[PDB]
Enzyme design. Structure first.
Site, mmCIF file in Angstrom:
data_model
loop_
_atom_site.group_PDB
_atom_site.id
_atom_site.type_symbol
_atom_site.label_atom_id
_atom_site.label_comp_id
_atom_site.label_asym_id
_atom_site.label_seq_id
_atom_site.Cartn_x
_atom_site.Cartn_y
_atom_site.Cartn_z
ATOM 1 N N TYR A 1 4.174 -5.203 29.711
ATOM 2 C CA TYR A 1 3.448 -5.102 30.735
ATOM 3 C C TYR A 1 4.332 -5.606 31.797
ATOM 4 C CZ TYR A 1 -0.040 -5.202 34.398
ATOM 5 O OH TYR A 1 -0.695 -5.205 35.355
HETATM 6 O O1 LIG Z 1 -5.434 -6.168 34.544
HETATM 7 C C1 LIG Z 1 -3.989 -6.561 34.312
HETATM 8 C C2 LIG Z 1 -3.569 -7.835 35.403
HETATM 9 O O2 LIG Z 1 -4.341 -7.353 36.874
HETATM 10 C C3 LIG Z 1 -2.484 -8.117 35.672
HETATM 11 O O3 LIG Z 1 -2.214 -8.936 36.869
HETATM 12 C C4 LIG Z 1 -2.023 -9.181 34.467
HETATM 13 O O4 LIG Z 1 -2.737 -8.780 33.357
HETATM 14 C C5 LIG Z 1 -1.910 -10.639 34.800
HETATM 15 O O5 LIG Z 1 -1.322 -11.096 35.908
HETATM 16 C C6 LIG Z 1 -1.641 -11.765 33.525
HETATM 17 O O6 LIG Z 1 -0.229 -11.799 33.670
#
Ligand SMILES: OC[C@@H](O)[C@@H](O)[C@H](O)[C@@H](O)CO
Ligand SMILES: OC[C@@H](O)[C@@H](O)[C@H](O)[C@@H](O)CO
Ligand SMILES: OC[C@@H](O)[C@@H](O)[C@H](O)[C@@H](O)CO
Ligand SMILES: OC[C@@H](O)[C@@H](O)[C@H](O)[C@@H](O)CO
Lengths: 239, 239, 239, 239
Positions: free
Chosen positions: D150
């Site tokens: 992610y």
């Molecule tokens: O929904 C996901 C969230 O908005 C995102 O910002 C990351 O999960 C968080 O920054 C953890 O690092």
């Protein structure tokens, strides 16, 4: 080999600067060791014979930083390499730390490094060939929460190195840095208890003799190529 | 030496992957060259004798990416190294580029790289010792205005590498990447006219054989130490 | 509104600090303007009535930096906001620049900023609610080749801000910064000819009154939320 | 107000895209909500009257991504804003995750975002005025160890946004992103147990309605100024 080239190493009296100076000597070079501790240097000037040139410079006096450059050319000349290893540490929270060490640290980790580079560059531009290596850290590429004053200084180093080389490489000069994780050093006493406990890794941390070989690999490199940074850390260190 | 270790190299049929595969062979290793071009591989399988194992994988078919792992262990086993060199290029403005190559590029430069790592890691965790090197780029540490799709993919690689190694190093594994500037490659035809003109540096750009020695220096390193990244660029390249 | 809250602004005598101080006053607050130029302050102390408190501090004397904190509580108390806007500029090549301004710059752009934060935090931790905004720059997120000494200082600021807030937010404090592109300022005379020519954008650069509204938007924000940084630049500025 | 301007929002059926679409409507605009879930959209098309235009697009079919652009101009025309909020999550270790979601994620978080921008830009260049906002994340500015797939995608977004705007701003266009910390979302179920426990902060996390006001502040801004990024996180979130 390092032929008959000359190199200067700040903070060479101990730690990474010490390992770096000794490794250059092996490859065949005169090395000017620079540090505040003459008594520490003395023992090195004799059991290392002739090729070890000492230079006592506080490096935290504007008058002393400027002494640096000419004195190198005075004592040995033939400067082809500078290694700004001089650095300190301040960890823990921001409060609970004194305004003093801070100033002293940033000045040595940032101001001094820049001034040294600024003052030795004219020589290399006339002479052409030049080589510069700055001792950075893994903190240059991470916002370590437990060393706000130290990491920030290394972020400045990260920018400074890659940006300064863009305006000098036309004169046959190479600039780079080494970004090592934690390494065995008297500076390990200056750590907070945040982690350190991590540094108990039976993955014996990082040995200062290992980074020196990286420095050689950076120096001992085709002139056409420039290694700008090297990220190295103990395999068993979580960061 | 590389004893009797085995390594896999994606995009080994040409360019950096080709130089990396040949350098491993020299150190003493069986190397599995992976690429889409069997005709290109064929010529390598014979004039390189026995120790060169070919593996034809489109790598842009989800079914083919999964073929990768077992096939390596099928063809030779003894996997200790993975080198995800497979990559492409898309430069110029964002408009004037097709939706197609884009998809193909990010998938090969990001999706494929990850999946390959994901699929070969279980082996190394059981076996313990593992080594992984990803071919990044100088664009991983700069927002190059003329290659928006390419640089961004390398920024993803920068994060992925240092972050993934934090959750694997407890199993005796090393992960890192190489971030080279422009290098002689058929991919040089895919450049825009923005710069390229820069790449006319009589500072002969970067030779793909030079980065391979860096890869060896990364591999041929005390297990206790991990080199996570190496920033190298042609000395006469402005960036 | 800013109720009966008090704020302090370094370099408030001119530029962004000036715009920031005036905007806070509008929202309803006593503001302590801090700068070296008393004659410049004087004209502000009267045509701004009562709510403008002057405080003359060189800020480049270790003795003066420590004067800061108590004097604020002396002159007005009720400190809820600090804005470290004090900063300078050094551009061009590294050679051709004096060792002096450098030192003066990094100390003001890094050392002073930190010390100020360090010295005002104890108050906010006892009191709970605190707010801190540092004036960063677009150079904090780019390796601008023509300002090596300035950009590096802002990279340090980038780290310092996000890292320091991680060890203070448990005490009801918010920390952030503003990273604006070039803005109309007397500091525009300190630029090199590299670009500047860019700053001829009929896209009227950035007006210092516009960033102040961003500062308000940062302050005037649900306490549960913290804005850590804001990247703003003139639309017609190439970077 | 948003006069008679039109905006498009990907993933508008829920979460940040939902909050962003509703906030635009308030300011006075027709908004085209885009998502895969028609049943979710249906309930919005009626209790929001006339000004809510639905557009069902898988967005993970190359044929569907290209449907996007003309269909907007078909259904309402007058496109002045694009918001690429469509995104997903994959957390935990790299192993223990499927090759599938990965591909699906990077394609939606990177490939789709780019293609959408690529396909809507020609319109704005002819028309001149354009506005683009990408939903990034705090992970775009941190190497979060527990979400390798992610965070890396968001690092690509960070580069892509600031680099693409450098080659479009001459046509009267603004490009930026929002980098929020964790926010209440169905995506919170996709988290690992690493932290989450952190997200138990009685500092009620971040509410998706709060970021929308930041989006408005980005849109509702002097055309001469461009906000490229905004770092916002829950005050009581450790990162
Ligand atoms: O929904 C996901 C969230 O908005 C995102 O910002 C990351 O999960 C968080 O920054 C953890 O690092
Ligand atoms: O001796 C200091 C050490 O070499 C430095 O690298 C940092 O302390 C470490 O990276 C922690 O972030
Ligand atoms: O062949 C691609 C090259 O190796 C890559 O490094 C970039 O093109 C270069 O860095 C320009 O930013
Ligand atoms: O007045 C200084 C300016 O505000 C600063 O932002 C930089 O000069 C600019 O970003 C160039 O990189």
């Amino acid at each position: 080999e390092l032929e008959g080239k000359v190199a200067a190493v700040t903070g060479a009296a101990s730690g990474i600067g010490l390992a770096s100076a000794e490794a250059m000597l092996a490859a065949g070079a005169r090395v000017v060791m620079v540090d505040r501790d003459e008594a520490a240097l003395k023992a090195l000037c004799n059991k290392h014979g002739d090729t070890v040139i000492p230079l006592v410079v506080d490096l935290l006096d504007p008058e002393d930083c400027a002494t640096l450059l000419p004195r190198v050319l005075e004592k040995a000349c033939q400067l082809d390499i500078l290694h700004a290893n001089a650095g300190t540490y301040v960890g823990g929270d921001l409060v609970d730390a004194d305004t003093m060490a801070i100033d002293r640290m940033l000045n040595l980790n940032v101001n001094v490094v820049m001034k040294n580079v600024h003052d030795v560059l004219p020589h290399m531009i006339e002479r052409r060939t030049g080589d510069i290596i700055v001792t950075s850290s893994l903190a240059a590429h991470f916002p370590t929460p437990w060393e706000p004053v130290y990491a920030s200084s290394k972020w400045a180093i990260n920018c400074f190195v890659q940006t300064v080389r863009r305006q000098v490489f036309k004169h046959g000069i190479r600039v780079g840095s080494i970004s090592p994780g934690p390494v065995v050093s008297a500076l390990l006493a200056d750590w907070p208890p945040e982690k350190l406990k991590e540094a108990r890794d039976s993955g014996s941390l990082l040995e200062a003799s290992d980074v020196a070989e990286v420095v050689m690999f950076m120096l001992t490199r085709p002139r056409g190529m420039t290694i700008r940074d090297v990220l190295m850390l103990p395999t068993n260190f979580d960061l």
